[PDB]
Each structure stands twice: as C-alpha cells, then as structure tokens.
Design a protein around this nucleic acid. Structure first.
Length: 52
RNA sequence: GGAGAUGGGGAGCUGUAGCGAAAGCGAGUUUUAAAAGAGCGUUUGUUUGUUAUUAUAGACCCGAAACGGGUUGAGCUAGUC
C-alpha cells in the first residue's frame, strides 16, 4: 500500500513505501480474533481466591 | 518470556486396511475339504471453544442410631484399703 514514513517534526516524508501483498489478506477471519482476545484476557487471572 | 498471548519443543495421540483367539494373510479375510455360503470389511478426517449427559473424588443440600482409634474422668455412687 501507501505506507509512508514520518519524521520527528510530525511532518511526513515525501517518499512513501510500498508493501508486499502477502501481508494484506483478501480473506479475513473474525472468529479466531475473538477467540484470541478471550484467551489473552484469560491467562491474565491469578485465581488466588479460596473458601472453606 | 511482563507471576503474559506466544516462539521453540514431534516424544507421543487420533485417522490413513481390515480380519482372526493367534502365528499369519491382505482389499481381502475367519470358519471350512471348499476358492461355494454366511460373519466382518472393500475411506470420510482432526484440534479447540461452548452446551447437555455421564465416570472417580462427600459430588444437589440437610438428616441418623452407629463403627473404629487416641485420651479425660471413682471430688456423686459401688466395692476394697
């Protein structure tokens, strides 16, 4: 695509960088995204609770 | 490795050829003298998520009389001294 470089001033550069098309997929998966976000929101749990 | 997602890690797991008690044979095979007949086979996978049911753990909850083991008690009462 037209990915373009930025300087520290905040003003862009004048020479954008093209991208290999293998990065951008024509087919999107929207169930594995959701599964991944849940599996990462879990695994962040200590689970130290206890009761007699 | 941020008490991380994940990366490495193919050792194993299931499926890919069944049949037979077994050696064995092999899209055939066991029984059988039989290459007939019949039985069984002649491809539809796997790993996770979630839910229902189920197994071993008290396993919906409450409820015994009891069983066993260790200790404490003869300052009432029974006996003896």
């Amino acid at each position: 695509a037209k990915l373009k470089l930025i300087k520290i001033d905040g003003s862009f550069e004048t020479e954008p960088v093209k991208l290999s098309p293998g990065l951008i997929a024509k087919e999107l998966k929207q169930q594995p995204v959701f599964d991944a976000v849940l599996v990462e929101q879990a695994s962040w749990r200590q689970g130290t609770h206890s009761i007699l």
